[PDB]
Amino acid sequence: MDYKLKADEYNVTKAILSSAFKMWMDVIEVDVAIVGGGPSGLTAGKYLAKEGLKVVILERHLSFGGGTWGGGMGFPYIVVEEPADEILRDAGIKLEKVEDVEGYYIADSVEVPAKLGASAIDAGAKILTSVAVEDLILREDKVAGVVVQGYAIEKAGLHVDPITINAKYVIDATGHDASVTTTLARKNKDLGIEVPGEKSMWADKGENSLLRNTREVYPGLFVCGMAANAVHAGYRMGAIFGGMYLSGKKCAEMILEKLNK
Amino acid sequence: MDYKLKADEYNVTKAILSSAFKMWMDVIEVDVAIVGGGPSGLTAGKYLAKEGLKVVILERHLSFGGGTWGGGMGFPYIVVEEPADEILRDAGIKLEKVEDVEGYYIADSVEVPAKLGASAIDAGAKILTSVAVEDLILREDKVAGVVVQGYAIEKAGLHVDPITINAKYVIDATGHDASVTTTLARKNKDLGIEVPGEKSMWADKGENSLLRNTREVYPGLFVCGMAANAVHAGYRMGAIFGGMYLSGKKCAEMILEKLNK
Amino acid sequence: MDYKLKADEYNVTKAILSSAFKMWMDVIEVDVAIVGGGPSGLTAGKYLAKEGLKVVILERHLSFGGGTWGGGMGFPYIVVEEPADEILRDAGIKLEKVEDVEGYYIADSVEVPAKLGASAIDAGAKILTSVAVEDLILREDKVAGVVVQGYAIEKAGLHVDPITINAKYVIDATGHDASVTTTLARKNKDLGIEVPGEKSMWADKGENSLLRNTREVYPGLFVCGMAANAVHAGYRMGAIFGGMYLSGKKCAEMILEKLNK
Amino acid sequence: MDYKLKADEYNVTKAILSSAFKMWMDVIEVDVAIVGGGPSGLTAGKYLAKEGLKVVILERHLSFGGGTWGGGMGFPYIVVEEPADEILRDAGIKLEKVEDVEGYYIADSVEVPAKLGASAIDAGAKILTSVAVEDLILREDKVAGVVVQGYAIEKAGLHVDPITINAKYVIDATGHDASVTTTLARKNKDLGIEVPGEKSMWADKGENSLLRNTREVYPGLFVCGMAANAVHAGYRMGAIFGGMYLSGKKCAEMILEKLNK
Amino acid sequence: MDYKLKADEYNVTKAILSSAFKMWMDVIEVDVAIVGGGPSGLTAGKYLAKEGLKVVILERHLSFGGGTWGGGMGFPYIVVEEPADEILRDAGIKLEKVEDVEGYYIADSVEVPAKLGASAIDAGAKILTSVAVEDLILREDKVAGVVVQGYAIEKAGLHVDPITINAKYVIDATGHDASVTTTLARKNKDLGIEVPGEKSMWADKGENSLLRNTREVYPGLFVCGMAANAVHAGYRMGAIFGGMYLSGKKCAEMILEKLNK
Amino acid sequence: MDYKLKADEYNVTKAILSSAFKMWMDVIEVDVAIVGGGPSGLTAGKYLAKEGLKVVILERHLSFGGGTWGGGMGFPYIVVEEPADEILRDAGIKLEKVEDVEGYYIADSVEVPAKLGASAIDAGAKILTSVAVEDLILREDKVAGVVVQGYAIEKAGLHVDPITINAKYVIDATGHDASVTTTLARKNKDLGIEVPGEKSMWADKGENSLLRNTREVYPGLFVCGMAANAVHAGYRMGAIFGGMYLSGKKCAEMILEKLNK
Numbered sequence A, B, C, D, E, F: 001m002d003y004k005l006k007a008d009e010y011n012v013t014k015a016i017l018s019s020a021f022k023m024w025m026d027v028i029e030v031d032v033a034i035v036g037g038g039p040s041g042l043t044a045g046k047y048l049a050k051e052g053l054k055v056v057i058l059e060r061h062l063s064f065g066g067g068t069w070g071g072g073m074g075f076p077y078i079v080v081e082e083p084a085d086e087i088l089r090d091a092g093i094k095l096e097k098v099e100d101v102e103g104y105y106i107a108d109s110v111e112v113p114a115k116l117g118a119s120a121i122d123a124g125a126k127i128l129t130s131v132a133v134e135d136l137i138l139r140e141d142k143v144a145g146v147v148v149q150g151y152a153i154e155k156a157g158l159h160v161d162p163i164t165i166n167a168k169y170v171i172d173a174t175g176h177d178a179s180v181t182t183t184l185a186r187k188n189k190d191l192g193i194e195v196p197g198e199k200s201m202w203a204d205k206g207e208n209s210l211l212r213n214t215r216e217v218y219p220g221l222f223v224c225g226m227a228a229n230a231v232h233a234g235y236r237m238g239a240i241f242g243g244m245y246l247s248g249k250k251c252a253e254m255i256l257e258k259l260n261k
């Protein structure tokens, strides 16, 4: 059975433009602006939106997921350890027990980002891709939002002004580059912020410092995921993501306590 | 609650390599190999796997979704017309009615790919990203599989041999480039296959020729989505995706009839 | 034992220049000039030099080996089927029997090129790397040598004249690109030579046409390895190399009969 | 005589994947991980494997050999001085006496890497090419392994997690870049390691400091070859390789004494 | 002797602009416009200017000389056979007799372009570098000049209009690319001009067809040097330049007869 | 009259290789090695060779001349002031008086490099193009030569060892980059050499400091031309070259006094 389909150019374009502009008018003021659509950023966004907060996750690339897609050296699987596996189970991700290691679970590296993103959207978080955060909005002794630019404009090297998103809290979940905190420190030397970068690999120590390092680095700016270890010179952990998920959830919980919600 | 996490380097690497190995040993022989992880490819894979077939969706880029992510000219929304809207609802995608056009629905362009991919995986389809199909496996008067290469190896220009995936049917769901059918035609001139490419834009005619053009172009090779209009010189339709979803579902139904008769 | 080493700059440079000079004066006239330092080219060179012929193997890249190094899709192993396995054993390559397929042997993809090249050198063949063959030397109704250029000069796009190597026979062992035969055909339209290129993958038919296709395409110019299937529109076979080795050995045997009759 | 060859796609792919995964499962834990497949790295690997140690040589490029291939300024010959010429003789490399200088020997720059690599493989060392070491595994006051990434993934700029290789000792044989020691020093400022880089050319002094500079720079991390002079600000020696070979052999001997084997 | 030098910015800039302006006003109408500052172009320009004609040599690159500089494969020497050696001696170039080949002379590949250019300038020819000829000026059944563009503008890809140079005769001395004749043929299909390109290498036949091929291909457009063999499908000859010099001199003699009859 | 020309491939290649190797054997030991084939380097080479010294000028690009070719902002003329105009007159360069300024002369920017290079060659200096000086040869408290690499090898990024040229004195005439002195200072921090770079433009002061700044910066290493002002933080002078020529001649005179010749 082949259906006669209703299609045109004018109403499709008009519908897309109307929805996109209504969307933009609503996103320019949020409770939390999460920079980076990776495992920790998608987790923080889900747990904040889950509680009724107005949240936007900003991802530079056209698609979200960060460094999960490729797994380990291209082998498409990632490891999660207890109790962080419960966060992936909550997103409907299929997990298998690693035989020689109690507490280790393995998941398809392509299934994880897709389901974590879908779960954040279902919790009420807005995910905007192809949007690069190039700077922050400042106020006296605090961060008050982010400065966004189109990824294509940035990549094409065009000299164009950005637009802004006002937020009560900003989360730097940009990975080992800690690009948001690094930009804040580089452009505002008077603040005395230093981003030493991650140390070499030591999974045991790297995973067990992420939660301690997930905190407010400057008023209004939180750091989570690998960016937390990059800002506090913590070790790397490899293709094990338990700490990334727990770091994102802790970040949400810390901001919820500050907003009393 | 303080979390003492179990983490190391050796067992994480071993677990990833073992799972990836077991996966590769299973995926080298499938019932259907779908080339392209776009809207039509993800739909065809879901409806084929839903019926118990062994299916693999091969996507060149690190993430799937194809041309959905960006919406229309960067505006992050896409249109779907009835009855294709039901396919998106089956994947749990949130749809809004377009004001003034009965039959039109609009969806967040970032939510669609994430949920379509998650739905295909839940139906039992395997999605492999970062894998480029560079050629086909031939037999007397038929296609019998695909020749795959790592996307990074291809992009880096390294001279490396590929590996193969045997399949009863191959689906070219690579979009307007119809790369699979074009490669078959270019390397095997004796077959007399021609890929004229898509015509200019005419949404009404473009959308209503996709189902008619979704067919077996060469024994063992089916074409669906925008690749069907590229192979049969059909018009383009823009950011309206109803035909892409229905074309993928029709493709699955056509292959299911062949394999169950 | 403490080592007091004799070292300077002048005598090291002088020794290198003298040896390179003496080498170039000898290599400008050879019996056979093999273009391509891949599996078939290295085999043809070994079996020709083994019989006392003056042979030179010209490779574009800094190192030889061609497409063997990477194995299959980066997995560092390659397959060889009997009786071609004997050619690899003659070079001292370690082979393992494939479980479940009688006649199949597997070898480390890094060990093969190193040992095939060392075996060709020990047989008396000269291997020159970083040398690109950009054209052929012609005579009435025959090829009489090759036109060589430095790979760095070619890559840098510098406008520099090449030098030449006179040869009784030239072997195009450049792989699927069949660059030597393609250049001959493109620059000399009057000869009526056509290079259709390889067909799609079909290992069974592809491997069993290589020997038939290993022949003299134009007087003085032989084709072997994957270039033979590219010139005669044969199928591809993937990471199985038995035919490549046997094609190189057959090429050497065919030229030896011509030069000893 | 043309043989009917047994060939297919499925069993070739399956055999390659099985061998590659059995290989990867074995390489993730070694006695020594040598970074760099150049003259000193290939020598150190040969002399360690020769004594029964489990060794892996990791090379970034598709082929090993480092800076030997090109000889001096493209002239394809390299010089070796006594007693280092015995190391090349042990690999079966053909040497000629330099006439004006007693103690100097010259060799074909293409024959050296091929035979040094074949000799290391025959001694029992595993050589993995197309593998970039991007970081180290650390423990309290020591290096405990390497962090590896696919060269194509690294070159393609893909954001993908690496995998690891546990080792009792790591050898930085990456040449004048001393990339392993430089990464350790750059990412772990708390260790106080400095990599000044090589000084200008002075063959006499450069060659006679290599052995003194071949040592353990940090517990578990040895440096050899030009990397030894780069880490200790030693002079360059040019296309004379005696010190590179003796440095690699000394490195092996020093590690064998520490492992008591 | 201490030197007190007179220097400023204003008068230096003013002097350069005034001279360049006066120069451009004079060069926009010439008797002959030679395209290409290579061996044949520099020779044709010298012999035309020597007879009192107003001549301009237009070279795309910042410096003239073409493919002489690099000699053969980077070896900085070029061969000239009698009687063309006399043309180089007339320019003051030092020549050495080739041992064992009577009639062959060898010259420093860096000395040749410098002296040929200086000789053309001393004969009265104007050489303009960094000027690309992108098209021709046409009239009924004839070429009447050239369309010039700045090489930097062309290289930078800027969309800028060119300027023109009116000439009684134009010489295509652009080498094997025969860019001027190829542009004329490509943009004016109605003229029926074909540029097959050079054939493979055959020095004996290639050198002995250059003079025969040095002729008027279209009224007002002459072809000389390697461009003459490219337009008439002649063979290549390598690093022997006798024919290039004699072809340039013949071209000048042919144009002089036309302009004095 | 068209002559029957003697031409072949073998003897042309043999003649070029023989001359190039005889040349290389002679150039590896010189009295002075001049780095940079610009106005000051070509002048210094001419005046040193004029006195019977064995001199080699090494230029990175395929052609010499440096920044003279383009004149001022592409306007093809350069200014020379008294008494430096006599140096250009000695090379046979045609000069015109600048009308408003007594002491200023203007010359064709294309005629200058060609004639300065031809004059240096006629004085007995050897000019090698396409040769990059990447480092220096050191001895106790002195520079003893240069480390050379092929420009194409350097540009192509190939990992290849260089060769050397022993010299009593080295001249850094590389322009405002002062690449030779900068490399010496960067690689040998123990020497305490600093290269601040040129200051902004001030022709009067820039031209009148060049001679004072033309001196021996480190034993065996002289600096001349703009490199002299770059090493001593002198001002720029623009398209006026009087100081460049006088600086090169002074450099020659200073070295002749040290060599007592």
Ligand SMILES: Nc1ncnc2c1ncn2[C@@H]1O[C@H](COP(=O)(O)OP(=O)(O)OC[C@@H](O)[C@@H](O)C(=O)CO)[C@@H](O)[C@H]1O
Binding pocket: A035, A036, A037, A038, A039, A040, A041, A058, A059, A060, A061, A064, A065, A066, A067, A068, A131, A132, A133, A134, A173, A174, A175, A176, A177, A179, A180, A224, A225, A226, A227, A236, A237, A238, A239, A240, A241, A244, D161
């Ligand atoms: N300035 C920016 N604006 C917007 N997005 C940005 C910006 N900078 C980075 N991003 C984007 O943020 C995302 C961060 O995802 P990413 O996956 O890098 O960070 P993560 O959530 O902490 O997880 C890190 C692990 O993948 C890995 O490091 C590991 O060791 C395993 O545990 C990536 O997808 C970037 O494209």
Ligand SMILES: Nc1ncnc2c1ncn2[C@@H]1O[C@H](COP(=O)(O)OP(=O)(O)OC[C@@H](O)[C@@H](O)C(=O)CO)[C@@H](O)[C@H]1O
Binding pocket: B035, B036, B037, B038, B039, B040, B041, B058, B059, B060, B061, B064, B065, B066, B067, B068, B131, B132, B133, B134, B173, B174, B175, B176, B177, B179, B180, B224, B225, B226, B227, B236, B237, B238, B239, B240, B241, B244
């Ligand atoms: N050789 C290949 N191997 C693997 N993947 C491939 C190959 N060639 C293409 N792909 C991948 O296939 C996917 C194709 O997805 P794509 O979204 O382009 O195709 P589609 O499912 O038919 O939908 C088309 C619409 O987006 C759009 O065209 C439209 O409606 C306007 O008229 C993209 O994600 C490619 O990266």
Ligand SMILES: Nc1ncnc2c1ncn2[C@@H]1O[C@H](COP(=O)(O)OP(=O)(O)OC[C@@H](O)[C@@H](O)C(=O)CO)[C@@H](O)[C@H]1O
Binding pocket: B161, C035, C036, C037, C038, C039, C040, C041, C058, C059, C060, C061, C064, C065, C066, C067, C068, C131, C132, C133, C134, C173, C174, C175, C176, C177, C179, C180, C224, C225, C226, C227, C236, C237, C238, C239, C240, C241, C244
């Ligand atoms: N013009 C040239 N001059 C010099 N070298 C050249 C030129 N063109 C190519 N080469 C060099 O020639 C070598 C060819 O080696 P290559 O390995 O590609 O050819 P082969 O010996 O027939 O073996 C082919 C298989 O690897 C593979 O195709 C297969 O089995 C799948 O069907 C490569 O190393 C090139 O760099």
Ligand SMILES: Nc1ncnc2c1ncn2[C@@H]1O[C@H](COP(=O)(O)OP(=O)(O)OC[C@@H](O)[C@@H](O)C(=O)CO)[C@@H](O)[C@H]1O
Binding pocket: D035, D036, D037, D038, D039, D040, D041, D058, D059, D060, D061, D064, D065, D066, D067, D068, D131, D132, D133, D134, D173, D174, D175, D176, D177, D179, D180, D224, D225, D226, D227, D236, D237, D238, D239, D240, D241, D244, F161
């Ligand atoms: N991070 C990395 N991971 C893996 N491989 C690497 C990495 N960094 C470098 N390599 C690879 O390591 C290899 C080092 O080989 P290389 O030849 O550079 O080092 P070497 O053994 O000390 O010998 C140095 C001489 O060639 C030369 O400098 C000289 O003066 C003559 O004596 C090269 O082939 C690199 O590609």
Ligand SMILES: Nc1ncnc2c1ncn2[C@@H]1O[C@H](COP(=O)(O)OP(=O)(O)OC[C@@H](O)[C@@H](O)C(=O)CO)[C@@H](O)[C@H]1O
Binding pocket: C161, E035, E036, E037, E038, E039, E040, E041, E058, E059, E060, E061, E064, E065, E066, E067, E068, E131, E132, E133, E134, E173, E174, E175, E176, E177, E179, E180, E224, E225, E226, E227, E236, E237, E238, E239, E240, E241, E244
């Ligand atoms: N459209 C253009 N406008 C201006 N200059 C141009 C244009 N196209 C080419 N040129 C310039 O013209 C010059 C041509 O010099 P070229 O040296 O290439 O031509 P030639 O004078 O005939 O001598 C050819 C030999 O070098 C060589 O081919 C040989 O003997 C082997 O068979 C080169 O310097 C180009 O940059």
Ligand SMILES: Nc1ncnc2c1ncn2[C@@H]1O[C@H](COP(=O)(O)OP(=O)(O)OC[C@@H](O)[C@@H](O)C(=O)CO)[C@@H](O)[C@H]1O
Binding pocket: F035, F036, F037, F038, F039, F040, F041, F058, F059, F060, F061, F064, F065, F066, F067, F068, F131, F132, F133, F134, F173, F174, F175, F176, F177, F179, F180, F224, F225, F226, F227, F236, F237, F238, F239, F240, F241, F244
């Ligand atoms: N490492 C190197 N090896 C070889 N050649 C080199 C190297 N570095 C630079 N060169 C080459 O050296 C040449 C230097 O020529 P350059 O013209 O730059 O130096 P110069 O003789 O002092 O004259 C400077 C003026 O052109 C200009 O600055 C000015 O203000 C007017 O007076 C240039 O042609 C480079 O390509």
Ligand code: NA
Binding pocket: B028, B029, B163, B164, B165, B166, D009, D010, D011, D013
């Ligand atoms: Na298969």
Ligand code: NA
Binding pocket: E028, E029, E163, E164, E165, E166
């Ligand atoms: Na004009």
Ligand code: NA
Binding pocket: C028, C029, C163, C164, C165, C166, F009, F010, F011, F013
């Ligand atoms: Na020759």
Ligand SMILES: [Tb+3]
Binding pocket: A002
């Ligand atoms: Tb119908």
Ligand SMILES: [Tb+3]
Binding pocket: A029
């Ligand atoms: Tb508000």
Ligand SMILES: [Tb+3]
Binding pocket: A124
């Ligand atoms: Tb709600």
Ligand SMILES: [Tb+3]
Binding pocket: A082, A083
């Ligand atoms: Tb527990």
Ligand SMILES: [Tb+3]
Binding pocket: none
């Ligand atoms: Tb345990």
Ligand SMILES: [Tb+3]
Binding pocket: none
């Ligand atoms: Tb328990």
Ligand SMILES: [Tb+3]
Binding pocket: none
């Ligand atoms: Tb507040």
